Amino acid sequence: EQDDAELATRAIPELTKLLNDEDQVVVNKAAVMVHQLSKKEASRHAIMRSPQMVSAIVRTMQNTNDVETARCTAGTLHNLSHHREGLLAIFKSGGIPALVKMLGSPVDSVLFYAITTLHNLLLHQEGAKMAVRLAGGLQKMVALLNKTNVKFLAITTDCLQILAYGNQESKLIILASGGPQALVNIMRTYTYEKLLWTTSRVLKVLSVCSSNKPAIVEAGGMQALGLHLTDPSQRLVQNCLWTLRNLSDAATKQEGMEGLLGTLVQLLGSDDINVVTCAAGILSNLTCNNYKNKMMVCQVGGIEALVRTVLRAGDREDITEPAICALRHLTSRHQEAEMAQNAVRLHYGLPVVVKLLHPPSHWPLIKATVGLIRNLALCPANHAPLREQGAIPRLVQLLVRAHQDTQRFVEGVRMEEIVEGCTGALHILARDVHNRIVIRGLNTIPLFVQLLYSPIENIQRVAAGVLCELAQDKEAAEAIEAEGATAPLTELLHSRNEGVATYAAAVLFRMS
């Protein structure tokens, strides 16, 4: 073993001169021998410790027109790339720019050596990422995504993922070279799990970029990623889900989504907390202002599945904020919204939803829960149970808190949205006579009248609306007059908002 190293060390200087010789017959033979040397452990340690030999190998690979000489030098460099010290020699000898040129080779063996060596450098060699980028390696790797060897594609896509992570420039290059369509096509075509996994990781990295994200959606990546949501490989499923969640907010104009939504609803019952989390967040965005998707989600038992997720989640706002938001969406503005409002009750959802209004809930989850209750209150069968769970005193208490703040962004949420939301929910709960006795008995009429002076139009409308509902009973109509409500309601008659003026007239009539 030690005598092998001595023999190699002495041969190398002479082998170096022959390898960088004019005569290509000399060079071919020298390169074949250098490759044979690089297979044995002792003599390859000698090769990587000679900077001039490694340079000769790199120069010859760049320059040769002989196929056997391309294969041997590339194989030599590939053997050196399994060791830290060999990686450093390749880097220091301008071997990254050379290997990037070889990614354009028509010789498949050279291509396969070049990508695997480059993969080794990208994993283990400080500086290798900037060098590959600098050499224009990304444009070339993207062009290679139309090859059909699945193993070569798995390594190519992993090189793309390493290079794109945390680098805006590499994401845009990938996009400018047709990266999205090629990646999405791979997901639509192959079944090799290693390749699906690496490709899904590139798409995950591109899905946070705001130029790439729309491009992935247009190519059908939403539907392509959905195809693998029940694969036995968990790392594949989780990557597809993380990616779908990033893309979800730009996919609301998309169609042929029936299969994806169906599977997301089934995934809400996973015992994996990251799966449930992504399924909830994706569903919340895909139901947002999309009546077609809402109908499909309700039809496959989405309400039950979402209520069960809120019950399991507890004080986990990462899960409840999106789940509640999806329920909010499914309970308004489509054919089956009445059925959905009833369904939240029938599947044990009312007690748990009212509880989410209470601490330690934060303002994003409170804003959305208030909104869900507002929708649920459109269905008369929820009026009574919602009263029983304590929704009214708590909505009123949040309204006082948010209004007092607006005189004397908290947690991401504007306090005016909480005033509009809570009063809006009280506006609709006040359709029940029993609710009117609770609301009024909490000394709310003074504050509702003071809200008529609010500059924001949406708050005027909602405050006038709840005042309008309360006035239908006589004793309440007198307390509204006594609070000096006549003046501000008269000035609200001449409003550009049609609803504000309507409710304002209706209050004035019922005070006589």
């Binding site: 798995a154 993380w242 907010d249 947002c288 909010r328």
Partner: peptide
């Protein structure tokens, strides 16, 4: 009518982290 629908903006790149590939790489070149 009901409450306003709203998008939540998820922008998570995850983390970077290979050994399944070591087998792929050596199989591809032999």
């Amino acid at each position: 009518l009901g409450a306003n629908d709203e998008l939540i903006s998820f922008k998570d790149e995850g983390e970077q982290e290979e050994r399944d590939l070591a087998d792929v790489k050596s199989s591809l070149v032999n």
